[PDB]
Design a protein. Structure first.
Lengths: 106, 1341, 151
């Protein structure tokens, strides 16, 4: 319900970041994903407990290195949204790279 | 100098002290091993595609009695050439010819064949075949799949470090790993009990997985506890004593032995008291009562009166049970043993926790536990138990996993079926209890013996199995009801979904990657790359921060150096030089055998499990010629940590000092004297470099450059070479040697030199010839020189004269000051070839062809174009010039009542409103290279592409005519030789052509033989020539695949020459990058007493922080190398005799320490000395190895020969002030590099452009532009300054207003310079969005 | 662009590339060619920019002569990450920086980038030359230790 809005906002901001930073590889294209992981995440606990209540995100982790180790729950719940957003936006970034080479008539 | 017929021109002075037994490998065994295992067919059913064929076939699945077996997987031919299919933009794949057979059996006929069909070839599968380098092509682009590492099937262990309980208690688990299917794990409880985890679900009870083996609980507990016989016969209460079963026991009561006391209360239980009880034959004696109360009845007992429900499973005995067993009269009572005292009784506790002891209740419980909720239906539980039971299709324990399961349990067999059995889970539980005791240590997670490295063949097989089970699903669908409806040539399997699946897999996201075009050492380290990211390592059951760290198994298997500079640092480990994948899949590095007296020169390949018990000596240790160890205490190691051993306690030895580094960082001399992070940084400098035009050799190398340049495949390697016939700038042909020769295929081989075509990272590839004319070569010798290659030796960058001083500020911390002479030599002038990919849109209405004659174009731009909108080859495009004519089709506008004059002038919108031309976005300059218009079958593009067709026809004729002309010349020689015995008319042969009127009437037997042989051979050669010519003619002019939205795809290669620039992204081999401050002229730079100005000045102040002593020694050694080369150049310019330069070359190549290089002269004399003098006149190629390389004394004794001061402090002057410098500068020579980044490519700050509705995001000034990232912290910095108007521009006017940009542009251009402050058109949008609801916004002060 | 070092141009001055500064002040070039009467129409000024003759460089030298600018790295953890300077034309495509501003920027000269913000209004020029100069801030705004330290 609210995770779809965050997903669409992250897709739009990541498309604008790859449009602006105009890089054309799959090895160095990660700083635009760092732009999407640091901007599209919600700030305080209201939307964080509101987005994770909606579908699209789970508690289990894909990579062990990105999991934080602290006693504050809000840092782990923010890094959860960040890691899930990077995992769900890697393939969409490569799809918009495949659409990106012949999108704008220039 | 007789090794590969190219070292004789350029002798490398090797400083390798330690002896080498094993030579340098092919460096592509990892990429080619799985390919030669997957494609080559094995009649034995293991390790291949035939092994995957025999594991799922034959199947019928519904009452058919008709099996399908097809033993044919050998025939396969590529459809075109590799380079031609790479140019044409088509994927490079080959069909798989599989011949099938079918057997139809009658009803109730065992082993009866009534009908059969024969199929010679069934078209299925289009597999791409890799080349000898390992670059298979999709859509005209080479793709390299990165090899991975995955958790091999076996038995794993982990301690869990007290994670889920957080007190500090360990939790041992034995997670069995299959090849595919469900995973099973065991769990320890904080209350010391066992649980089962299946597919990461909740906790299962313990003994339900083991009592489902058609077993009873009493048999399980009798398998647990052993050999305790407590007997009661007429109130006896006397049992058997066990002295040897226990080492100590707290005796709380008096223990007597045959009328006398043996162990008193609180008596000694020492070795003497045990010996006095064991030496005397003591029968069964009385025990105290309280030993019984701590015991548990074991087996299923029944009384005389009562039956069941007593002593069933873990019944704690009380005072109500002793009277019952005394009334029933039990002769033998089985009680506990307290087995495994180091761990304790744990099975009886799990029996006490688990209420269920029946098998059917266990199946109902596990059937309700797998699903979230299902009612018990008496057949679902058996099906769910069979699904977890080991089978063939749903479960796999193939040869690697079965061998690991045998080695984990100390079994002696290696061959078995891929299924578990009844005793296997019992042995796994026994192994878990054995780890719980302590006999046997817990294996670490990050061993290389636990993780198996998989390559591209296993990945292709694992993806092909999904297509194969789809194929057998289609076969099971087709064989249903199709008894007489087989249709073996008609109703076969559609090969389109499996081709789409293999095209998606070889064009995947994580696995298949693009090969980086810069510095082909980067290519050969992409081909030797092992990463952990992907769908296979996506699960990560046991991972964390420890996986990214280094384990001491990483000694010689992979390298700890080569990791990328991104976030994933520590998880990509490049494979080392000498390591080799075993036949199971694990990595093995070679070790030579050491006997008692001598050292045997043979080598073995050792794995991690072998070296866990073996002893491995160090690499740097003394060894004489015979093999006797002269050192009494050789420093060695046992399990990874170095500790001093004796001379005979080791039986292995390292072959060479190269195994601890891979091929990427083996080009850096003195890796001891550089820091590890800085060596990693130097590897990240060497991973990217554009090729240079001059390509000067590394004067300081390691000897790895020739091996990389001969093993990467970027240069042409001459096979069966010999006398060279003809070499030009595009072709190399070699006359065949008389040593090896094919009967009928003696001929010549053609080497087509690839010219300047576009690569992946916009780089040029070129192949310069090495042998000019008339020189014998060897099979293995090089002939072409690729990008960054100097005469078959790898030359990534170029070296220059370096002055170590602080300058006037132009080198701050690590900046670089260069000279103007480097610009004068056109040095590292990069050549960037980009792609012009034209598009011709096809709509619902209008024509499809894009033609010439586009209006609204000036005649100055139309003069450089030929017909049909293509420019001439050699015309320069600068910015907005037209390379191809873009054409919108004539649809969408012919049914318009308006704009008739616009359709008369500039009809159907042939150009845009206001846009640039479609060549390159603006800011460039450069000429065209090659046009690649490829046509469709029936498209009529002759007027645009007739030139390339005629040119490629002439190239094909010039390539494939010379071999048959040499064969025809040999035919004419045999004509001139066959008529010697009869009718000598050689003057008539030389006078009249055409075989002297075609072999006139000589002696009849020889005449008939000559006419028959010449007619037969001439007609067959003419027919074969016409067949090859017509076949290649049908190959060239044809059609290829294309998207239906476009008609043609025009590819124009556009070369751009980029001059010198102050950014330059310049670096070295030791992790020292820097930028150009200012282009410094020649006359104002320091120079020595001979007047040679320096070429580059870097900053020594970074030296004590970047820890680069190897840079200093490379500098001081390159100084001596170029000094020897300059003395050779002076002897050449003085034109001395051969014998005077000969003694100098001998003294330069023998004087030193024991570097064991037995190269010498008097092999070739009076020739080829001037050639090597002209080769090495620009500098001496001294090869310095990494670990057994140069010392300081070797550098001093070699540098005294070049008439240079020993400390390196060469006194310099000044070019700006002329004052003699104090603190004499150690000048020398360093091998510099230019990276991929360019300062003119990083250009930004677009201007006010049209077609922008919000935030100036579409159509700015760039290639593809977008306006954002002012920042979220810079706004707060402007708040911290107190900037209001700059922040006001950051809010509305400069940032987020359309009318405000026009007003500000009018203010700047008209000269008003009025800001007009306020809240323009953003707060108005806020008011329109707030007042849309039932609440409004008023207006007050 | 890529930041390089400039061993001159006293503290309230830095460098700026030629082909970048020719483009950064394009409406200012248009306005001053309208003011001096050298360009009659706007397309004449757009052609005079494309020709790159000497009087265009004279007008550009009149633009850059006493006009401020902002240099602004992407990590601004504190206020001294963005600093106002004075551009001087440098041959090439890279930016020459004052040597002693590296501790305030917390980065070394290895190819790190810095945005070049042009003050477009007169009040923004006053904000640059009054508050954001490197000569206005000598001490640190958090400790009192001077931020300009030789290295």
């Amino acid at each position: 319900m609210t995770y779809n809005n965050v997903f669409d906002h992250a897709y739009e901001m990541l498309k604008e970041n790859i449009r602006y930073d105009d890089i054309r590889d799959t090895d160095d294209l990660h700083d635009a994903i760092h732009m999407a992981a640091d901007n599209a995440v919600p700030h305080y606990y209201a939307d964080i407990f509101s987005v994770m209540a909606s579908e699209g995100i789970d508690l289990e982790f894909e990579d062990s290195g990105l999991m934080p180790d602290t006693k504050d729950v809000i840092r782990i719940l923010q890094a959860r949204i960040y890691e899930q957003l990077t995992i769900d936006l890697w393939e969409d970034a490569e799809d918009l790279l495949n659409e990106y080479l012949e999108e704008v008539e220039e | 100098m007789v090794y590969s017929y190219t070292e004789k021109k350029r002798i490398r002075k090797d400083f390798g002290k330690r002896p080498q037994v094993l030579d340098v490998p092919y460096l592509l065994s990892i990429q080619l091993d799985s390919f030669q295992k997957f494609i080559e067919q094995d009649p034995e059913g293991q390790y291949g595609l035939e092994a995957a064929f025999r594991s799922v076939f034959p199947i019928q699945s519904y009452s058919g009695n008709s099996e399908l077996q097809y033993v044919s997987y050998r025939l396969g031919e590529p459809v075109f050439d590799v380079q031609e299919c790479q140019i044409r933009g088509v994927t490079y794949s080959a069909p798989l010819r599989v011949k099938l057979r079918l057997v139809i059996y009658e009803r109730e006929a065992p082993e009866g064949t009534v009908k059969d069909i024969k199929e010679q070839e069934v078209y299925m599968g289009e597999i791409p075949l890799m080349t000898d380098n390992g670059t298979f092509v999709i859509n005209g682009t080479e793709r390299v799949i990165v090899s991975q590492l995955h958790r091999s099937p076996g038995v794993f262990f982990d301690s869990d470090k007290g994670k889920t309980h957080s007190s500090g208690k360990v939790l041992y688990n034995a997670r069995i790993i299959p090849y595919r299917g469900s995973w099973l794990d065991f769990e320890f409880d904080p209350k010391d009990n066992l649980f089962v985890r299946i597919d990461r679900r909740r906790k299962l009870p313990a003994t339900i997985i083991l009592r489902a083996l058609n077993y009873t609980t009493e048999q399980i507990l009798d398998l647990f506890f052993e050999k305790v016989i407590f007997e009661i016969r007429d109130n006896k209460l006397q049992m058997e004593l066990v002295p040897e079963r226990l080492r100590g026991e707290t005796a709380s009561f008096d223990i007597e032995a045959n009328g006398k006391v043996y162990v008193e209360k609180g008596r000694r239980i020492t070795a003497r008291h045990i010996r006095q009880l064991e030496k005397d034959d003591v029968k069964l004696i009385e025990v105290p009562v309280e030993y019984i109360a701590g015991k548990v009845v074991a087996k299923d007992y029944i009384d005389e009166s009562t039956g069941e429900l007593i002593c069933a499973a873990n019944m704690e005995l009380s005072l109500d049970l002793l009277a019952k067993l005394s009334q029933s009269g039990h002769k033998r009572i089985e009680t506990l043993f307290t087995n495994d005292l180091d761990h304790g009784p744990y099975i009886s506790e799990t029996l006490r926790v688990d209420p269920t002891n029946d098998r059917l209740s266990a199946l109902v419980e596990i059937y309700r536990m797998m699903r979230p909720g299902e009612p018990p239906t008496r057949e679902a539980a058996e099906s769910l138990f069979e699904n977890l039971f080991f089978s063939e299709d749903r479960y796999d324990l193939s040869a690697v996993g079965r061998m690991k399961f045998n080695r984990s349990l100390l079994r002696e067999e290696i061959e078995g079926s891929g299924i578990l059995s009844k005793d296997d889970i019992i042995d796994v539980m026994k192994k878990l209890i054995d780890i719980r005791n302590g006999k046997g240590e817990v294996d670490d997670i990050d061993h290389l013996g636990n993780r198996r490295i998989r390559s591209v063949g296993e990945m292709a097989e694992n993806q092909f199995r999904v297509g194969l089970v789809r194929v057998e699903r289609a076969v099971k669908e087709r064989l249903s009801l199709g008894d007489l409806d087989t249709l073996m040539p008609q109703d076969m399997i559609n090969a389109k979904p499996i081709s789409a699946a293999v095209k998606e897999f070889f064009g995947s996201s994580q696995l298949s990657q693009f090969m980086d075009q810069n510095n082909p050492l980067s290519e050969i380290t992409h081909k030797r790359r092992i990463s952990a990211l992907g769908p296979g390592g996506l699960t990560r059951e046991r991972a964390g921060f420890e996986v990214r760290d280094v384990h001491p198994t990483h000694y010689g298997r992979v390298c700890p150096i080569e990791t990328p500079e991104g976030p994933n640092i520590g998880l990509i480990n490049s494979l080392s030089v000498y390591a080799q994948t075993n036949e199971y899949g694990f990595l093995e590095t070679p070790y030579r055998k050491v006997t008692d007296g001598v050292v045997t020169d043979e080598i073995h390949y050792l794995s991690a499990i072998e070296e866990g018990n073996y002893v491995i000596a160090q690499a740097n240790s003394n060894l004489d010629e015979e093999g006797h160890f002269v050192e009494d205490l050789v420093t060695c190691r046992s399990k990874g940590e170095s500790s001093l051993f004796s001379r005979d306690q080791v039986d292995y030895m390292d072959v060479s000092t190269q195994q601890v580094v891979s091929v990427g960082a083996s080009l850096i001399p003195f890796l001891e004297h550089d820091d590890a992070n800085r060596a990693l940084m130097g590897a990240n400098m060497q991973r990217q470099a554009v090729p240079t035009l001059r390509a000067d050799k590394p004067l300081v190398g390691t000897g790895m450059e020739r091996a990389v340049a001969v093993d990467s495949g970027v240069t042409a390697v001459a096979k069966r070479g010999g006398v060279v016939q003809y070499v030009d700038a595009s072709r190399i042909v070699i006359k065949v040697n008389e040593d090896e020769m094919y009967p009928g295929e003696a001929g010549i081989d053609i080497y087509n030199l690839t010219k300047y075509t576009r690569s992946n990272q916009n780089t040029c590839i070129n192949q310069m010839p090495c042998v000019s004319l008339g020189e014998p070569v060897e099979r293995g010798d090089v002939l072409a020189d690729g990008p960054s290659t100097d005469l078959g030796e790898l030359a990534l960058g170029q070296n220059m004269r370096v002055a170590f001083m602080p300058w006037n500020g132009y080198n701050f911390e690590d900046s670089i000051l260069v000279s103007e002479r480097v610009v004068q030599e056109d040095r590292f002038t990069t050549i960037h070839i980009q792609e012009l990919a034209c598009v011709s849109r096809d709509t619902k209405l209008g024509p499809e062809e894009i033609t010439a004659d586009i209006p609204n174009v000036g005649e100055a731009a139309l003069s450089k174009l030929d017909e049909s909108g293509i420019v001439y080859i050699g015309a320069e495009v600068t910015g907005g010039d037209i390379l191809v004519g873009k054409v919108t089709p004539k649809g969408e506008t012919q049914l318009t009542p308006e704009e008739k004059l616009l359709r008369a002038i500039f009809g159907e919108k042939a150009s845009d409103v206001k846009d640039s031309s479609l060549r390159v976005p603006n800011g460039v300059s450069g000429t065209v290279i090659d046009v690649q218009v490829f046509t469709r079958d029936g498209v009529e593009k002759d007027k645009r592409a007739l030139e390339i067709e005629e040119m490629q026809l002439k190239q094909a004729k010039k390539d494939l005519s010379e071999e048959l002309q040499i064969l025809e010349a040999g035919l004419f020689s045999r004509i001139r030789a066959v008529l010697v015995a009869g009718g000598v008319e050689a003057e008539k042969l030389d006078k009249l052509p055409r075989d002297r009127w075609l072999e006139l009437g000589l002696t009849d037997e020889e005449k008939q033989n000559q006419l028959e042989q010449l007619a037969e051979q001439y007609d067959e050669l003419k027919h074969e020539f016409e067949k090859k010519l017509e076949a290649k003619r049908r190959k060239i002019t044809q059609g290829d695949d294309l998207a239906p939205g476009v008609l043609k795809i025009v590819k124009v290669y556009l070369a751009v020459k980029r001059r010198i620039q102050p950014g330059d992204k310049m670096a070295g081999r030791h992790g020292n990058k820097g930028v150009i401050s200012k282009i410094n002229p020649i006359e104002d730079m320091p120079y020595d007493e001979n007047g040679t100005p320096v070429d580059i000045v870097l900053n020594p102040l970074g030296v004590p922080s970047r820890m680069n002593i190897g840079q200093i020694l490379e500098t001081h050694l390159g100084m001596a190398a170029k000094g020897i080369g300059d003395k050779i150049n002076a002897m050449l310019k003085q034109q001395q005799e051969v014998a005077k330069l000969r003694e100098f070359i001998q003294r330069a190549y023998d004087l030193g320490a024991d570097v064991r290089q037995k190269v010498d002269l008097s092999t070739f004399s009076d020739e080829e000395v001037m050639r090597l003098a002209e080769n090495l006149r620009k500098g001496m190629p001294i090869a310095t190895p990494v670990f057994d390389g140069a010392k300081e004394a070797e550098i001093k004794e070699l540098l005294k020969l070049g008439d240079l001061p020993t400390s390196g402090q060469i006194r310099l002057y000044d070019g700006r002030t002329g004052e003699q410098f104090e603190r004499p500068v150690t000048v020398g020579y360093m091998y510099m590099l230019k990276l991929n980044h360019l300062v003119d490519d990083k250009m930004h700050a677009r201007s006010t452009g049209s077609y922008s509705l919000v935030t100036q995001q579409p159509l700015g000034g760039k290639a593809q532009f977008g306006g954002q990232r002012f920042g979220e912290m810079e706004v707060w910095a402007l708040e911290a300054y107190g900037a209001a108007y700059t922040l006001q521009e950051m809010l509305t006017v400069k940032s987020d207003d359309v009318n405000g940009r026009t007003k500000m542009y009018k203010n700047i251009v008209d000269g008003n310079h009025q800001m007009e402050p306020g809240m323009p058109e953003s707060f108005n949008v806020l008011l329109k969005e707030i007042r849309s609801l039932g609440i409004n916004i008023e207006l007050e002060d | 662009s890529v930041i390089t070092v400039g061993p001159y141009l006293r503290l309230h001055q830095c460098g700026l590339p030629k082909k970048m500064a020719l483009e950064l002040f394009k409406p200012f070039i248009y306005g001053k060619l309208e003011l001096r009467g050298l360009a009659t129409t706007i397309k004449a000024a757009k052609k005079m920019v494309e020709r790159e003759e000497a009087v265009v460089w004279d007008i550009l030298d009149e633009v850059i002569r006493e006009h401020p600018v902002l240099l602004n790295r992407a990590p601004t953890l504190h206020r001294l990450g963005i600093q106002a300077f004075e551009p001087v034309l440098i041959e090439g495509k890279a930016i020459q920086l004052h040597p002693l501003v590296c501790a305030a920027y917390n980065a070394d000269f290895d190819g790190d980038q810095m945005a070049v913000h042009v003050p477009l209004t007169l009040e923004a020029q006053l904000e640059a030359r009054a508050l954001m100069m490197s000569t206005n801030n000598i001490l640190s705004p958090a400790n009192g230790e001077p931020i300009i330290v030789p290295s």
